[PDB]
């Protein structure tokens, strides 16, 4: 109910002063107003790192000072137990001891006996701490362009990105969540550079009248400490006119990009207050764009600060989803970092659950309900893929208290009480399972009842906030899992605790071997299907559910399920649909018009099998039908889920020409965008099986012929095929699938190669007002998908033939596009990213030799994030395939030494995803000194961020995981 934490807190005043750009330091004093709880509270603990305190003071009395860092290395630096398990357990216990959720110590000021007698008299105190941040090595960021003479004034900015508990790294506090406080914030800033944090503009004139300004932001609204961040430097734009109080802060020469970017946000506010039945529960809302991003999502109190990658300036069409997608994320996680709050790390999952569900509801009534279901399919793809890679993602209410583990989910790391042990794969699937558990709450409880629940939560939050700090009656904003469950059961009490003990408290992905049997094939038994499941390693036995069957022309049959899963079950049978030449359309689904006796329609009243088409269960369903039923699903079905799962099932085995015909019929209608992308991939995989069975034409030429008429297109489609984004996505996708069309003689895509060359010839001027960039990028990706691995028979790598014959033309085109984007550049060098992927594929086919020096020169510092991340993916795969130890040493040294966090994040991420030095396959000899240097990089040099040593924990998961590394 209540927090197990003494020393309640009310007020805190920050005052940043003397912020430097040359020695790059910060000095400041912080002010805490504290009501202690119990007597003999002598060793009062706060917590921070990289903070040299100048002095501490309580009412003109400098007391004692304790400053420890057990977040650093093991207490013996040469602890020979250099394995995963001992380091994981010792680090979990050590950083739990860093956490003040016990009698612990990181910053323990000792109360003297005089002030102890004062605590015996009055438990009301004030804390004044003068301190100084150095050159910030994990707590702030000083983005400075390398000029330093004049453009350090105009062109640089100062901010703080970080994780949830990164407030420790910036200014000293408690465990930085779950301390409902109020703040006064004093900012010694430049006259041009504007400081952006929480609260309100409560005292701002040209302040202190000497040379600079000083900002007073007061946060009276009670939040936690894990919401404060200070962006200094950008320029003010009000993009108000619809709701009059939305403020934005961005760097100069980026301002009409904001004038296009911000709008449609008022619609998101309108829909969120249709959901919540309130107002926006603040004064105003702030947004800062910045050329760095620890997290792309990041959402704080009345303020969203994230990357200058999401502008999307009116011509750059393929961020039409992404921009307001990330804005919806940075409003939802905003709303649930503001008021509703966890009591512990194990109690969080409700928050990001309801936030992801709220921006999913936003994705419902803004764009693409079928794309919304496709996003749910991508969520299931992510969850099934990761929890078949690794174990489950469990949502604990249960602790390991009493030095206990209780962790079957400890295949790698600790998960119960602590954030900074987890991986971003685990964190992403935490959010993904939060999405789908909220969809299970949809599946058992009505949406209107959820609106009632959420209105009750925000009613208790807004009533408990903005008051005179009611003593002992103020922690109602801690709305964690237990009381939230009680509120749901008060609204509608059902079997939601079985839903918890299934999906919240048993982290398992469930496959489904629902074996199709065929009764009423003029049979004695009537329409029966067997249920079966067993697949251990990561399995789960889920019982009572329902099953959806569509008839030929008839009812949605729904059938119960049972536990003890060696089962046989029935169907609420259709009539005997006989004389079906007369029974043409007896109401299939409304007024849909379809006629085929082409199936096995002698004695078959069934068409399709389905288990929960609204996608309740974390599922991977495996079964078999007749192939005619699968192909008849792809002429029309009212589920994009059914369409793309039949697309996968018909990507596996078949090759008739009627499949190609029905695929081309499905691709020429108004059905869906990405269904046709994966259907062109069906055409690719099936025409790859047309080596000896080349019955049709060379495919997908007639699809460009019969669908696109500019001026009737005399054999060639050239100009101005836009303003219909169906054709935009389709022309973006299809030549990539055309480049896969291969029959095995030399795989011979020569007509397709020349056709793609002719398409690259025929680009448009400014008649298209749509910045023809991604079309070029995916055609270069089709050139990358022109993999020809079998040219170098003996030695043709090293400028022998000036290698021949079409590879040289592809080199000409990628040279042209690289130098055009060196001269033109149009939007982020995305063409250069596709070209570098093409150059790596050519290095993987032995045409351009395996040399990292181009990728080395594009992994340098002063480039864009995407260029650098593509070159780093390239050099990670280079270290995987080739035996380059020296570039791995440089890669680890740049993991140690660079100021950008996200490139380190993604180096570690896709170094874990694409590993060299593979466990129990050790030919390049990691045992020599690489185990030692990786152990050092886990211990030392990684006190900057938590996630970098989390990625290093992922590295030792991949590299020599549950054993000694076979050194000694």
């Amino acid at each position: 109910f209540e927090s197990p934490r003494p020393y309640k807190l009310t007020h805190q005043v920050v005052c940043i002063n003397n912020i430097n750009f040359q020695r790059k330091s910060v000095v400041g004093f912080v002010e805490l107003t504290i009501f202690p709880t119990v007597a003999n509270l002598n060793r009062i603990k706060l917590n921070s790192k990289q903070c040299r305190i100048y002095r501490v003071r309580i009412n003109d009395l400098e007391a004692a000072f304790i400053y420890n860092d057990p977040t650093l290395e093991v207490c013996h630096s040469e602890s020979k137990q250099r394995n995963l398990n001992y380091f994981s357990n010792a680090y979990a216990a050590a950083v739990s001891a860093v956490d003040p959720d016990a009698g612990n110590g990181e910053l323990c000021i000792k109360v003297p006996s005089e002030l102890w007698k004062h605590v015996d008299e009055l438990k009301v105190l004030k804390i004044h701490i003068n301190f100084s941040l150095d050159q910030p090595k994990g707590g702030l960021h000083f983005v400075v362009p390398s000029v330093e003479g004049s453009m350090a004034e105009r062109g640089a900015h100062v901010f703080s990105c970080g994780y949830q508990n990164s407030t420790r790294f910036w200014f000293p506090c408690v465990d930085s969540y779950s301390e409902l406080c109020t703040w006064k914030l004093e900012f010694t800033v430049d006259a041009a550079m504007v400081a952006v944090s929480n609260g309100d503009l409560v005292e701002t004139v040209y302040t202190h009248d000497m040379r600079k300004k000083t900002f007073h932001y007061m946060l009276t609204i009670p939040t936690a400490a894990s919401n404060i961040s200070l962006a200094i430097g950008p320029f003010e734009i009000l993009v108000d006119p619809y709701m009059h109080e939305v403020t934005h802060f961005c760097l100069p020469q980026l301002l009409p990009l904001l004038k296009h970017t911000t709008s449609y946000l008022h619609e998101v506010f309108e829909f969120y207050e249709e959901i919540l039945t309130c107002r926006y529960p603040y004064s105003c809302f702030k947004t800062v764009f910045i050329d760095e991003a620890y997290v792309e999502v990041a959402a704080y109190a009345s303020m969203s600060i994230f990357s200058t990658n999401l502008l999307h300036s009116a011509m750059i069409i393929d961020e039409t989803p992404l921009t307001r997608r990330c804005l919806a994320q940075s409003l939802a996680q905003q709303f649930f970092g503001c008021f509703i709050s966890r009591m512990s790390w194990s109690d969080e999952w409700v928050l990001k659950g309801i936030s992801g569900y709220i921006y999913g509801l936003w994705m419902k009534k803004t764009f693409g309900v079928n794309e919304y279901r496709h996003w749910i399919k991508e969520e299931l793809d992510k969850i099934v893929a990761y929890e078949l890679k690794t174990g489950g993602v469990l949502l604990h209410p249960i602790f390991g208290g009493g030095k206990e583990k209780d962790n079957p989910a400890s295949h790698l790391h600790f998960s119960i009480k602590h954030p900074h042990t987890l991986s971003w794969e685990y964190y992403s699937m935490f959010q993904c399972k939060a999405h789908l558990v909220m969809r299970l709450i949809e599946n058992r409880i009505s949406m209107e009842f959820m609106l009632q629940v959420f209105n009750k939560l925000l009613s208790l939050a807004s009533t408990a906030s903005s008051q005179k700090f009611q003593s002992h009656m103020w922690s109602q904003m801690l709305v964690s899992t237990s009381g939230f469950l009680k509120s749901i059961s008060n609204v509608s009490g059902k079997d939601i605790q079985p839903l918890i003990k299934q999906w919240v408290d048993q982290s398992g992905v469930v496959k489904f071997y629902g074996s199709f049997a065929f009764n009423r094939k003029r049979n004695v038994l009537e329409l029966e299907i067997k249920q079966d499941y067993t697949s251990p390693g990561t399995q789960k036995y889920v019982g009572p559910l329902k099953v959806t069957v569509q008839e030929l022309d008839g009812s949605f049959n729904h059938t119960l399920q049972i536990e003890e899963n060696s089962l046989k079950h029935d169907i609420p049978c259709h009539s005997k649909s006989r004389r079906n030449k007369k029974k043409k359309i007896p109401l299939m689904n409304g007024e849909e018009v379809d006629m085929d006796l082409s199936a096995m329609d002698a004695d078959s009243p069934l068409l399709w099998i389905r288990i929960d088409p609204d996608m309740s269960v974390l599922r991977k369903v495996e079964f078999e039908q007749a192939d005619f039923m699968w192909q008849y699903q792809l002429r029309y079905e009212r589920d994009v889920v059914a369409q793309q799962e039949s697309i996968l099932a018909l990507e596996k085995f078949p090759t008739p020409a009627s499949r190609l015909a029905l695929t081309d019929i499905l691709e020429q209608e108004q059905c869906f965008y990405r269904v046709r992308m994966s259907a062109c991939f069906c055409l690719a995989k099936i025409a790859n099986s047309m080596v000896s069975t080349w019955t049709g034409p060379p495919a997908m030429k007639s699809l460009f012929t019969r669908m696109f008429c500019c001026k009737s297109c005399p054999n060639i489609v050239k100009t101005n095929n836009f303003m219909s984004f169906q054709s935009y996505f389709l022309q973006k996708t299809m030549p990539v699938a055309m480049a896969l069309l291969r029959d095995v003689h030399n795989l011979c895509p020569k007509e397709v190669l020349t056709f793609i060359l002719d398409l690259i010839k025929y680009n448009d001027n400014r008649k298209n007002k749509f910045s023809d960039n991604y079309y070029r990028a995916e055609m270069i990706d089709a050139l990358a998908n022109s993999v020809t691995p079998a040219v170098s028979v003996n030695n043709e790598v090293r400028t022998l033939d000036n290698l021949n014959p079409d590879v040289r033309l592809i080199l000409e085109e990628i040279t042209r596009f690289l130098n055009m984007e060196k001269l033109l550049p149009s939007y982020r060098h995305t063409i250069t990213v596709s070209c570098l992927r093409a150059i790596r594929v050519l290095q993987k086919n032995g045409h351009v030799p395996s040399d990292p020096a181009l990728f080395k020169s594009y992994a340098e510092y002063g480039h864009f994030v995407d260029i650098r991340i593509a070159a780093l993916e390239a050099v990670v795969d280079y270290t995987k395939v080739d035996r380059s130890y020296e570039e791995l040493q440089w890669l680890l040294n740049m993991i140690q030494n660079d100021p950008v966090p996200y490139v380190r994040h993604k180096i570690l991420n896709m170094l874990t995803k694409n590993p060299p030095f593979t466990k129990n396959m050790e030919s390049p000899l990691c045992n020599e000194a690489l185990v030692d240097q990786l152990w050092k990089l886990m211990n030392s040099g990684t006190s900057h961020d938590w996630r970098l040593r989390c990625g290093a924990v992922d590295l030792y998961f991949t590299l020599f995981g549950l054993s000694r590394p076979s050194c000694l």
Partner: peptide, 22 residues
Amino acid sequence: VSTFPLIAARPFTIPYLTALLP
């Protein structure tokens, strides 16, 4: 020098004002 003399990397100070300019 004859066939494919690709332009080497510049890397310069401020990437976001250049690579995000219409």
